[PDB]
């Protein structure tokens, strides 16, 4: 079970909520201290006081003072009125892991929610109720939290295979009866950033997975193309250039090619360079290559950079995770406080650097199938990895292409994060647009798996063609076992859509790690 | 029907194609021709001389040269080994907009091609076998025509009902026997900018028609606030500054308007604003504004600055649409040219045009609901048009969050007509990356039409609070009735995004368009 | 003085050397340790054993075996060869920030180097010989550094008066006898990311400067409307979102308000509001706010997030700063390492991260400045803060223009981490171009400080027309009177772009923040 305590919730708990359907339980304290903190509350509410949202209109329309006798209306009105959202659907683990965090939002208490609305919203977690929303709208995330917010009072719609259904229906088949809205609940519901937190939770979460089967097939690759392991070794960073994320790959590294029999030790490359080298010239010519190119060498450095990026990301969401990104807010003993925690800009930030940190994992990744395909970059390898008669057959000429697309479509893709517009009567003049970051980083994430897909079967490729198994080490052959299980090698020229969406589809299911945690004892970090 | 004969095809005549599923005729003039090229062409491949793609491998493979006894083998492994497309799948209207820009082209008759390739694509186009093709792979368009010179061939799949099916199931079932590669066909049939043209030629007309529904809707805005109809009068335009887009854009702005007794003559404003004037005073206050702000006025001078480009742009399909890109090329008594007119960089470069057009065309569309909304800058309108008591009720305050939303994300697409990254052995070192450029004119369009859809309803809206309905002009009553007839009025509170979605769909559709067309003498440029 | 032991070297450290010309100080240990490595690796190479960069061919050339006989003239034909920069020369502080980066990177003692290289680095900063470093040819930086080798070896130019003047010249006035490049030292000397470091190092340490002033002229601007205090509480961040960065600006923002007559409670906001209401009826209109506009509360959300990627990036720099950021590196009782320190992905990350960061703070600052010229939300004060007779006069409505131009401009500079380029034979497959995205972060850097300038200018003429300087905190009162000690107050209208660029001066040296720290108590994060 996963505790919704407002506190201790994690991107990797959101992920199993979202992705593996698993149990959430709000923990009793955490209903207490929203029941005494509702209690407390409506005796505030209860003086007719001037309280933003519950006494009041919303945004510029704040000089507008309501009476505490339209309490169930405005609040409703507000979530009828802000169900504005358009553009396609996040799918049912996407609408799982923004549900999930606007309950951790208000599990911690500061909220002045009735408890109902936590046990409501755990409910529909729990029994697979999936609210429809479209993905645009939030300013950064008022529209999307109103879909959401819709469903609770039995408004708006829920999905039901990838369609929308009515809520009215699906709740009277469910024996449930909708809630009805109390002062400040609407509000609360709708007022944070659950949209670009709880995607955002998902797509970085990934996104280091992405990471680790990104060091996986490089390895693979390295190891195929019998490259040197000097460019690892943990003096060079954990000595020489100290940033986490780059002694985290380069350890990653080590552990994969760890036993294999294709790889070469520095000391065997100048030796075997040494005698190749006559005594007489001041200047002689040599096949052998001390140090690989970049994309062969300067892995640590630059997955290191991204997992860097990857690392800052996820501790900013889990803060947001666990905050009262709400307003106006409660606090026993004090005025309520009236601030802007509804604000994204951490997380618009956070997720304009994944986009970028992703493109470039990717940029990195198809550099890699160049590498591999051209003949005279690659380390006895046919052009193409043609096994055939090249000419007559391509190969991989023509799967190269989807890769080296991909990575120019994610190059047109801009920050978000700054491009924040005006509106509500200038009321809203500075907002973060964090939910266009986080769906552009999904994107990247999405996109880096085809271009990962066409790298995992090249490798494999290149292991046949080579006639290099056998000297792969454990973890090599367990990632080739994995890619051969879905595809096979490739003899003639053949339809390749096919098996490239075949891999891309394992790998974001994480495919390529299980095989590893699976069939070896490397732990990756 | 419509004439594909390569010489005189229009991005309209595309549309109809593919989207009204205009019946294609191959004139039997470009099938003479298209037998004579392929005639000699084949005298020539049977004397085994060098030709690209033909007697050679293919891209840097080149350096092989291929027996003419492979003939068959050697188109068949391309078309097999470059369909590797990824990503979505084009709908069933791009999809023949596609094939039908590549049989255009092939009946150019310079491709050497057997008239049944041409006859083959005419069966497909008016039976209704539309291939199944990934959006993403084209370097600028080998990947995505493969897969439909697959179908051809009885592989690759086909679409039905938004699903991908085998081809060879579909073609047994529609008693149509695949078709065998010869000598260039299956070269010339993916060798070509179809994609980016064919879909280019789609948005482009689409993109026409949102400008005028832009001014459609703009000339209802400026009724309903009552605007000056000074900055659209000829002499400004025809006169002072002759762009032949704002010449166009204030011609249309006249004619929509023409018959408003809303609408104020200059004279009258300044007659009225010198009555309001005393004498003693050197400076002095007044509640009018002889001139209205940039989103009511320079409508001729920005929506004009997009048709420009849009006309630029068409102009490019065009020429495009009837020209032979393809390679090689043949041309009777002389040698076979070896070019590169599969090159899409000019069309490539007015997609990346249109995509900046469309953007700011959006940009402007939002102010002007920004206009209409807030009350400091609506001419007599209440707060977000609120019709009942404000605060307690939103009106339209929530629906301007996705078009406020819409301009930021259209602002985060880039273009992609610069971002060519080397492949194929550096081979392709330079290309133009055009298909997505023009999925990206493309979602800009499709993102206006969501913006353009909150604008509608606004004015509708906007037209009912004041009660101004009698006294708008004949064509801004038709757009009225347009919009009424799929929305009503907003009286309290209510979920928004059906609505929004009814009236963007009815954009897309050209609807509004229809309305003045069948509700009006108007013609509109 | 600063102490360079590739140990300990500090961002603010480095902009004292580069800014301040704080002497330098190689400290006796590091002079030891590079010694006893320097022997070590002598009779290494004096072994004619295969090294990168000493006895092989450079980049893709390392396939070339050079003989230890042509060890000087293989350096010097390297620094020769690579001194291909082009474009602006960077100023003297920037020059001096990338000589400290790299003698520090040295100083570590993995690259080999004689300790003389080490003095004569530390010589040209201590006696202020200033290389001539052109800005752009750094693929992330060879270019760069090599233009600052070849001034150790009395080639190349040395600044003076923003002009080149040749090294030789220089170095015979000053009584030097260049040095001769011995094994490894020219390579060593270009091989790293110093050019990034440096000039990042110098940008970041601003840029907190930046965050700084941004929240002095904020601070002053709420007093000057007589914003709420509610928004800084400690509960709403310190307890209910604690993000590292907007815990602090709330607590500077707390400390910078302290002793204010203007601002107003909440408790005073709400009860001026239940007055203000006569609860006759359900729903009534109020001239009072109970919250003011996002750009006045949502401050501590926004600047926080900058101050967070500052924070990062800071980390980042100073880790970089410190490591040997070399290739190849001498590690005693081991083989040489051959990696890819050199390459500055997590600079050029870093970087990227806080162009967009400061882009943000921009936004924020111009939206303040719409704020306060807007008469409909400046809260009173009058139109453009006109003092005298409007429309006759304009007042600064003419000053908000170039604050709205640089936002626009700062966001059309994109993201240079991702457009690596492959070069060099496709050796270096995969680049940072880290210099280009701390070039586009000092460019925003920059351009913020002439839109902060006007928002100086914009809160003290507030201060005047509204008569509120008595009520002023004394935090308030010291940045006002650092504003008219350098501009007056704005009467009649007159010529603003020397008053502006007067203001974006004095921000560039942190004026604001000398005036808090000599005028208050007042110690900001
Ligand atoms: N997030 C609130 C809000 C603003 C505007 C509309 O239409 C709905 C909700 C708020 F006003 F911004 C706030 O909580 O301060
Ligand atoms: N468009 C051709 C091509 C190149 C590369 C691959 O793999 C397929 C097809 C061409 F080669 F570029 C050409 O026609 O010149
Ligand atoms: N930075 C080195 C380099 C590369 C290319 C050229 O032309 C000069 C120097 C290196 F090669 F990258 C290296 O491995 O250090």
């Known amino acids: 079970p996963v505790s919704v305590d407002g506190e201790t919730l994690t991107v990797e708990a959101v ?5 593996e359907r698993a149990t959430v339980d709000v923990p009793a304290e955490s209903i207490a201290k929203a029941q005494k903190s509702r209690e407390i509350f409506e005796g505030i509410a209860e003086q007719n006081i001037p309280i933003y949202g519950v006494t009041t209109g919303y945004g510029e329309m704040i000089y507008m003072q309501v009476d505490k006798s339209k309490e169930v209306e405005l609040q409703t009105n ?10 396609p659907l996040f799918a049912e683990d996407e609408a799982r892991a923004i549900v999930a965090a606007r309950l951790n939002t208000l599990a911690k208490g500061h909220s002045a929610v009735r408890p109902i609305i936590l046990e409501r919203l755990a409910q529909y977690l729990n029994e697979g109720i999936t609210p429809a929303i479209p993905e645009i709208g939030s300013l950064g995330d008022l529209a999307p939290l109103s879909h959401v917010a819709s469903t609770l009072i039995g408004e708006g719609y829920v999905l039901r295979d990838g369609r929308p259904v ?8 469910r024996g449930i009866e909708p809630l009805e809205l109390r002062f400040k609940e609407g509000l609360a519901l709708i007022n944070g950033t659950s949209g670009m937190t709880g995607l955002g939770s998902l797509v970085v979460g990934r996104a280091l997975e992405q990471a680790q089967q990104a060091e996986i097939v490089t390895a693979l690759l390295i190891e195929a193309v019998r490259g040197s392991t000097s460019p690892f070794l943990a003096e060079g960073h954990d000595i020489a250039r100290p940033h986490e994320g780059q002694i985290d790959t380069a350890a990653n590294m080590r552990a994969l090619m760890r ?8 000391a065997d490359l100048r030796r075997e360079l040494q005698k190749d080298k006559e005594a007489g010239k001041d200047v002689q010519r040599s ?35 666990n905050s009262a990104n709400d307003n106006p807010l409660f606090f026993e003993g004090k005025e309520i406080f009236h601030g802007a925690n509804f604000h994204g800009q951490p997380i618009a930030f956070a997720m304009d650097f994944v986009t970028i940190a992703l493109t470039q994992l990717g940029v990195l990744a198809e550099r890699q199938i160049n590498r591999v395909l051209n003949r005279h970059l690659s380390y006895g390898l046919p052009e193409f990895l043609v096994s055939g008669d090249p000419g007559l057959h391509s190969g991989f000429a023509g799967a190269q292409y989807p890769a ?10 801009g920050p978000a994060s700054t491009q924040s517009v005006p509106s509500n009567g200038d009321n809203q003049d500075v907002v973060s647009m964090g939910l266009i970051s986080a769906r552009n980083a999904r994107r990247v994430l999405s996109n880096n798996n085809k271009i990962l897909a066409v790298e995992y079967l090249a490798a494999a490729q290149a292991v046949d063609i080579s006639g290099r198994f056998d000297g792969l080490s454990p973890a090599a052959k367990a990632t080739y ?14 339809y390749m859509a096919d098996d490239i969406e075949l891999v891309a589809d394992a790998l974001s299911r994480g495919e390529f790690l299980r095989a590893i ?9």
């Not at 036993?259 to 520095?266: C, F, I, P, Y």
């Open 15 to 19: 992920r199993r909520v979202a992705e």
């Open 78 to 87: 507000l979530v009828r009125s802000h169900s504005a959202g358009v553009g």
């Open 166 to 173: 009515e809520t009215a229906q699906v709740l009277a088949e």
């Open 259 to 266: 036993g294999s029999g294709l790889t070469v030790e520095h």
């Open 287 to 321: 096949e052998i290559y001390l140090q690989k190119a970049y994309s062969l060498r300067a892995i640590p450095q630059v997955v290191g950079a991204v997992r860097d990026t990857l690392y800052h990301a996820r501790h900013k969401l889990r803060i947001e995770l």
């Open 404 to 413: 080296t697309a991909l990575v120019a479509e994610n190059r047109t893709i």
């Open 481 to 494: 076992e994995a890619v051969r299980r879905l595809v096979p090698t490739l003899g003639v020229d053949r």
């Open 517 to 525: 945690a699976r069939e070896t004892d490397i732990q990756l970090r």
